[PDB]
Every structure is written in structure tokens, then in C-alpha cells.
């Protein structure tokens, strides 16, 4: 299973520089070209640089709105790759992706990592609050508030209650997020059967469970 | 760098319709040596990586339904999805890889349907959050269509028109709706002050508000 998984993203201040790894698996990392992407929140995909393979000599390229800013490089005995982001600016938070390439010819050798959120901010690290919203169909909820940066990973009963969930994408109010995640269930479900929220909020290594009591 | 412009940004398209998207680059992506085009197409569904469609203009990636074509050369280019399905909602990206890389800004596909009114459900502020000092007062409206709607709060016969936020999920992947939450955010003090608390949805179906209430001294 070829896999990429980028680390070392969350929240930084402006100014100075920050260093994003990927870890990758299941290839022969020295024969595939690896590439950099980010995409803003709510903006389109942005190419950011390239380090090519061993044949072509570990050269890299950048993208102009980079170049000279962000420098790309392989560590050839652990089959990562790295991306140092300097002089940073709020503006630099994004989802930062690595992904697999080659020539051209080759690009059906693409593969993506899920990516890891950069949050540029001089705001500070808070954990949520979270609070049940109790009430043939019945919707339940968790009102998840007050924290940053993002993100919070919600689930209902561990990931086990995953149909018929709505969870909101987070508000920023005076540098802090706020969600709120339902999940609608057969009446005959619940109260019978225990339904809990979870929130992790990897940030601040928090992980908070809640079970809606009926009230 | 080499410059890339997709058109529509945006647009909404009805299942099992045609919908064509266009991408244009400021130079060739002709290669002469292998005699393709390095244009690819990639699908990016909310929440998720992009995943490619199409290489080499218009070759089809393994496994890729044959709804999605692509065509072109040199530096003009399409892609088209002959029947949209529910599932194709996903931004759809062009993607040069002949000198460096550069993708386009991208074509946002929203699934329009049928207009549909909302599921609302209303919550009072928790007693946990007012033992802490706030109040939120938060209402669900679910599985509804268009996304804009006209969610108002009253508060004993008086609109609340401030302190009120509204966030969407992404729509729905099998029935195209959205769903939304409306967050009233009071002081404590000003949450003890009034009795009354509604949540009303004047959604275009209907003339009449699809309205939920509580009483704060009926907790």
C-alpha cells in the first residue's frame, strides 16, 4: 500500500520558520519525484515545489509565489520528505499536502497524503468546552466551544454512530472556534441504547466524552 | 510560471445532466517527444485529497467511470461528466505538468434538486454551559434546499437579530441537501431576562414559518 503521511503542522506564530515532514511507505522513494501543495481554507490548490528523484540528481523547482521563501528536501535513508517554510505570515495557514510524482509522462503515479493543517496565529492553543444537546426520528447533539486552533475530530458512540450525523464547520469569534455537531437516530434507539459524542482536540491533547441524558 | 484559468468557478447542475468544464494555459502543454498533452483533471470531494481522473488530456485513470471524458490539446482543454450523479458534488481541478506544475482554480460542481423544506429542532442552553456563565441557544434545520434561507430568532414576539451564527454542511453526497445550525449566542444575564426563545424557518415552499420554540420557565 503506497502511503504518505505529512506531520509536523499545527499551529505557529508569524515570523518565524517552520518545518513540515512526510513520512512515506510502500515505494521506492528514491526512483518517484515528491511534490508540496497547500490549499487555504475555502481557496483552490496551490502547487508549491518539487525535489525530482535519483536519476535527475535530487534537483529541486519552486513555484514563483514561493521561490526563495520555501525550500524542498529528501532524507534518502529514511524515505521522507520535508518542506521548510521561512519568514511565515498568517496568510501561509493551509492544508499542506505532499504527494508522489515523476515526469510528466508519468503522472498516473500520483498519490496524495491526507495533509495536516497549518495554522499561522498569534493566538493561543484553548481547549473546547463541550455541552450535550438533549432533546420516530430524534436529533441529539454536542455544542463543541471555545477553543483553538483547528482542528477537533467528532465521532458519536467512538465512530460507530456515523450515518445520519451533521458536524458543522467551526466559527472563529475572538480567536477562538466554535461547532456544533447532530446526529438524528430512531427514537427506538435512544434513550434504550447509550449515544455519546467524542471530541479530540489534538492541539491541546484533549479528549473529551459526553453522553446525551435525556432532559 | 505557466498560468491556468478554469471556467465556470462555480455551477449547479441537476443529476443525470451534462455538464462540460474548461481550462485554458498560457502556453503549450504539448510535449513533442512523447506527443501528449501533460493536462490532467483531478476531483477533489469535500473533506478529502484530490484524486485523478484523467492524464494525458484524455486518458482515463483505472477504475474512472466513463461519464468523465476529457479532451483537448495544446492550450485549451475540457472535461465532462455526461450524467451527473449525486457523488460527483467536488471541486474538479485542471492540472498542467508540463514545466514545473500548476493547477486552476478550480470548477466547484453544486448539485441543484428540488426545492425542500427543513427539519427543524431547537436547544435550549445546556445546564452544564450555564453553570459555566454562558448561554447558546442552538436549532438544526436539516435536509433542505437552496443553502440560503431566511433562519430568524424572536425572543418573547421580538426579532434577535444580533449575536446569531450559521454554518452549513457540505451537501449531501445521496440526496443533495444541506443541512445548517443556527447559534444564538447571549449573556447569561440576558438569556435570564426573556422567557420565550423561537427559532423560524421561512423556507420558499411555503408562505408559513416552520417554527420551534421553548419556554425558559417550563425547564
Known amino acids: 500500500e503506497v502511503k504518505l503521511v505529512e506531520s509536523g503542522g499545527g499551529l505557529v506564530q508569524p515570523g518565524g520558520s517552520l518545518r513540515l515532514a512526510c513520512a512515506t511507505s510502500?515505494?521506492?522513494?528514491?526512483?518517484?519525484?515528491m511534490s508540496w501543495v497547500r490549499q487555504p481554507p475555502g481557496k483552490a490548490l496551490e502547487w508549491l515545489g518539487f525535489?525530482?528523484?535519483?536519476?535527475?540528481?535530487?534537483?529541486?523547482e519552486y513555484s514563483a509565489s514561493v521561490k526563495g521563501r520555501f525550500t524542498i528536501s529528501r532524507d534518502n535513508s529514511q524515505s521522507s520528505l520535508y518542506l521548510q517554510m521561512n519568514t511565515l505570515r498568517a496568510e501561509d495557514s493551509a492544508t499542506y499536502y505532499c504527494?508522489?510524482?515523476?515526469?510528466?509522462?508519468?503522472?498516473?503515479?500520483?498519490?496524495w497524503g491526507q495533509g495536516t493543517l497549518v495554522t499561522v496565529s498569534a493566538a493561543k492553543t484553548t481547549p473546547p468546552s463541550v455541552y450535550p444537546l438533549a432533546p420516530s426520528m430524534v436529533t441529539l447533539g454536542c455544542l463543541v466551544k471555545g477553543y483553538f486552533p483547528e482542528p477537533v475530530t467528532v465521532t458519536w458512540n467512538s465512530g460507530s454512530l456515523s450515518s445520519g450525523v451533521h458536524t458543522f464547520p467551526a466559527v472563529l469569534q475572538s480567536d477562538l472556534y466554535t461547532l456544533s455537531s447532530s446526529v438524528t437516530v430512531p427514537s427506538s434507539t435512544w434513550p434504550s441504547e447509550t449515544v455519546t459524542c467524542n471530541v479530540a482536540h489534538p492541539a491541546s491533547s484533549t479528549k473529551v466524552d459526553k453522553k446525551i441524558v435525556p432532559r | 510560471d505557466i498560468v491556468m484559468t478554469q471556467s465556470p468557478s462555480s455551477l449547479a447542475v441537476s443529476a443525470g445532466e451534462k455538464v462540460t468544464m474548461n481550462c485554458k494555459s498560457s502556453?503549450?502543454?504539448?510535449?513533442?517527444?512523447?506527443?501528449?498533452?501533460?493536462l490532467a483533471w483531478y476531483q477533489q470531494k469535500p473533506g478529502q485529497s484530490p484524486k485523478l481522473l484523467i492524464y494525458?488530456?484524455?486518458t482515463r485513470e483505472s477504475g474512472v467511470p466513463d461519464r468523465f471524458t476529457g479532451s483537448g490539446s495544446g492550450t485549451d482543454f475540457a472535461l465532462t461528466i455526461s450524467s451527473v450523479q449525486a457523488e460527483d458534488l467536488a471541486v474538479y481541478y485542471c492540472?498542467?505538468?508540463?514545466?514545473?506544475?500548476?493547477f486552476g482554480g478550480g470548477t466547484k460542481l453544486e448539485i441543484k434538486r428540488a426545492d425542500a423544506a427543513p427539519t427543524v429542532s431547537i436547544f435550549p442552553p445546556s445546564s452544564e454551559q450555564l453553570t459555566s456563565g454562558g448561554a447558546s441557544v442552538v436549532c438544526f434545520l436539516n435536509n433542505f434546499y437552496p443553502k440560503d434561507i431566511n433562519v430568524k430568532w424572536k425572543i418573547d414576539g421580538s426579532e434577535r437579530q444580533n449575536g446569531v451564527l450559521n454554518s452549513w454542511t457540505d451537501q449531501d453526497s445521496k440526496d443533495s441537501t444541506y443541512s445548517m445550525s443556527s447559534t444564538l449566542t447571549l449573556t447569561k444575564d440576558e438569556y435570564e431576562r426573556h422567557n420565550s426563545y423561537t427559532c423560524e424557518a421561512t423556507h420558499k415552499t411555503s408562505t408559513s414559518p416552520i417554527v420551534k420554540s421553548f419556554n425558559r420557565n417550563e425547564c
Open positions: 494525458w488530456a484524455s
Open positions: 502556453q503549450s502543454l504539448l510535449n513533442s517527444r512523447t506527443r501528449k498533452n501533460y
Open positions: 525535489i525530482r528523484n535519483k536519476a535527475k540528481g535530487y534537483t529541486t
Open positions: 510502500g515505494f521506492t522513494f528514491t526512483d518517484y519525484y
Open positions: 492540472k498542467q505538468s508540463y514545466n514545473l506544475r500548476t
Open positions: 504527494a508522489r510524482d515523476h515526469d510528466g509522462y508519468y503522472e498516473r503515479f500520483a498519490y
